[PDB]
Design a protein around this ligand. Structure first.
Ligand code: SF4
Ligand code: SF4
Ligand code: SF4
Ligand code: SF4
Lengths: 445, 419
């Protein structure tokens, strides 16, 4: 008889002994955030469909407008009518409501404050003094249970803990001067060193973003995207589920930082800023690195967004997980063949970055992320075709052979219907929502 | 669950019975804001703003390793944790309810929002609507509402009877830190204007604001059943921040579709009346809207719009007849706030709106218990049949946003359920 699928069982079976799984050599150096394709001068500019060179997001805007006017939901993809095309872009735009400039990357700005002190919620609650009272719990085991319970309340579908590996913290962040208003932010970005010092609290000076040496841990969250919407990639509904999850990420960070602060510790939010989420997620045991470059998880595959919070709160690190992703990616290459920009390599892993956008010195499949970003204005969205076609993204990949769990190798061999089809709260799926149920035994051993 | 709802659907028309005495209700009259009820003693006998007195009780409980009134926690650490979680939950809510219209998160226009500014070149909020068909709009906006975190969504024509006559708000340029000390009253009026607008004197809603979208935001059953203790305060708090994010997300979508939208959370008008008219559930003895999916263990928010929409049918699954014989909430209420008597048209005090047929409760008695217990009680929600220790909650079942996978299928939605 059918074995009732068991996500907890699966994670126990594939857990590895302690130790960062990421393989590195001597040329590894911390990576300046300005080097990402979003921000580096070599890649930030892309032509629009008339050949005008603009900031990538403005050229993408040009394509969204063109598609709506032409009744399309994506590149060469006819919508049912202009009304439908319009609605997909309205939904996508609305999704970004709680996110600054596509990612909340500027640290200690807007939603990403490194201290709770000026927040309206903090001020309201000040007479209770939760943020001033010394911790009443120092036991990492109890703390892990508490903070994970809180994280699920805060919208995480997956959560894990790792020691903070500084190799993945940006050497310098992209940010804006403190006196610069939002409307000028995009034309006033600067770089600022992220450094570690013997100081009691996270603090920013004119010169540096300073993280205390006591910042021992990172808490990593997975925010699940919607399967039906993502599978319309690269068209508008895939952009919408991407967008809503960035706002969910932001809520998570603030909710969790406030909980941690009110427990008597400090907390640094980050969303897409501060450090590399995939590395943290892999070290925290959410999943494994993959050919496309994302963290693939047992529950959602790569179809999940990541955010992370850094803290001095004592915690128990989770174990990394190995469920055979690396061996599947070696033989699969489906994302590489389907990629509209041919950004993803079909070759072996190496320690040498393909270009400035990759961090050399860690063993990974090296993808050309300038080619990736280039397809975004062309398609008028955030693509996501690699996520959509990855077999791990499919809802039913796991089978049980009577003794243990394993991946089904067979799995590796329209937008109107989505608008008219199944949906549920936050785009989560009741047919799989049991997979992320959590009891104490799931949060700490 | 969709089965259940179509079985008990009634014909069109508001199920709320009213007489010729009914007048719109000034927000300041609520127990939260009225001068007769705003101040309560703390446990030392000091008179303070109700919430400040409630703070003193929370501090006192933490120090004494308690999760609620005379409810011992496993240890001080646990007590601390419950209050830290409760406090964090309110992160995206202003002053316990986001009631000031057109302030902070509750902006009546999207124009100054960072998201709107980033997206300005696409022109979605300036482009005339490409869809005016109410059937397609109802389907789009409900899909959007579920994306935005609603567990239930319904549409009704806007009954102005339930819109506050005057809102509680603050002057536009007053900073957050002075807000509580500078609350004022401001008329909400309807006029022939193209867009929602605020003047020095008035909050102006266009006469074209035809509809109200009501959302239900499900609270966590395990935590609410700890009422009046701290974990019941925590699920309350987290769902207020979910309300806020819903309003902002949905207003933005509606604006980007070419219409206008007014967010509200606990402000602008009375959520329970709207929810009943939009068919989410029925009014109850305790005063809440009881839903088939969640009973009363669900929060409400709403958005007002000129977007053409198909109103939902009100529902009647026997709540009124059940509440007539039950009286369990009234027996359990720690403050005896809830009447055991028949429904009347006459309010028990200033906090009630007279002229509508309802169970009349004494809500100053209810607020009175909040400083005493150091939380937001909720005992009535917890004991209500329609809804069905703290260490076991912290060690027990949880899932994303405190939703329950055993019941999450009940809120699945296809087009046929939307329009
Ligand atoms: S598509 Fe195949 S090769 Fe690409 S990340 Fe998924 S499993 Fe790996
Ligand atoms: S997002 Fe698109 S263009 Fe970029 S790597 Fe994935 S499939 Fe290729
Ligand atoms: S919240 Fe508590 S005090 Fe108020 S009415 Fe309900 S049971 Fe009574
Ligand atoms: S406890 Fe009983 S009387 Fe009170 S609202 Fe629930 S069903 Fe009605």
């Amino acid at each position: 008889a059918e074995k009732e699928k068991n996500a907890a069982e699966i994670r126990q079976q594939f857990a590895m002994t302690a130790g960062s799984p990421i393989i590195v050599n001597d040329k590894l150096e911390r990576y300046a955030e300005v080097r990402t394709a979003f921000t580096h001068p070599t890649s930030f500019f892309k032509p629009n469909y008339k050949g005008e060179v603009k900031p990538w997001f403005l050229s993408a805007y040009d394509e969204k407008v063109r598609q709506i006017e032409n009744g399309e939901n994506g590149p060469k993809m006819k919508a049912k009518n202009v009304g439908e095309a319009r609605a997909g872009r309205a939904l996508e735009a609305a999704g970004w409501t709680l996110d600054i400039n596509y990612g909340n990357i500027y640290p200690n700005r807007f939603f990403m404050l490194w201290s709770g002190e000026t927040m309206t919620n903090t001020q309201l609650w000040a007479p209770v003094g939760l943020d001033r009272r010394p911790p009443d719990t120092t036991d990492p085991v109890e703390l892990t249970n508490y903070v994970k319970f809180a994280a699920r309340m805060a919208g995480a579908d997956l959560v894990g803990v790792a020691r903070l590996n500084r190799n993945w913290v940006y050497s310098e962040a992209v940010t804006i001067p403190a006196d610069v208003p939002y409307e000028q932010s995009l034309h006033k970005e600067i770089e600022k060193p992220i450094v570690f010092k013997d100081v009691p609290l996270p603090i920013e000076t004119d010169d540096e973003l300073i993280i205390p040496n006591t910042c021992e841990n990172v808490i990593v969250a997975g925010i699940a995207m919607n399967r039906e919407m993502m599978q319309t990639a690269p068209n508008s509904m895939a952009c919408a589920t991407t967008a809503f999850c960035y706002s969910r990420m932001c809520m998570f960070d603030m909710w969790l930082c406030q909980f941690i602060r009110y427990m008597g510790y400090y907390a640094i939010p980050s969303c897409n800023g501060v450090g590399q989420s995939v590395a943290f997620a892999v070290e925290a045991g959410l999943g494994q690195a993959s050919r496309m470059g994302a963290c693939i998880t047992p529950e959602f595959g790569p179809n999940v967004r990541l955010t992370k919070v850094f803290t001095n709160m004592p915690l128990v690190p989770d174990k990394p997980i190995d469920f055979g992703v690396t061996e599947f990616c070696e033989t699969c290459k489906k994302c590489a063949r389907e990629c509209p920009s041919k950004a993803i390599t079909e070759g072996p892993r190496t320690f040498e970055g393909r270009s400035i956008h990759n961090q050399s010195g860690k063993l990974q499949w090296q993808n050309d992320y300038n080619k990736c970003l280039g397809y975004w204005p062309e398609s008028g969205g955030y693509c996501g075709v690699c996520v959509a076609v990855c077999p791990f993204t499919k809802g039913n990949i796991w089978i049980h052979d009577g003794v243990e769990w394993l991946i089904d190798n067979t799995r590796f061999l329209n937008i109107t219907e989505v608008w008219d089809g199944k949906i549920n709260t936050y785009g989560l799926d009741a047919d799989h929502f049991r997979d992320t149920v959590s009891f104490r035994k799931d949060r700490v051993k």
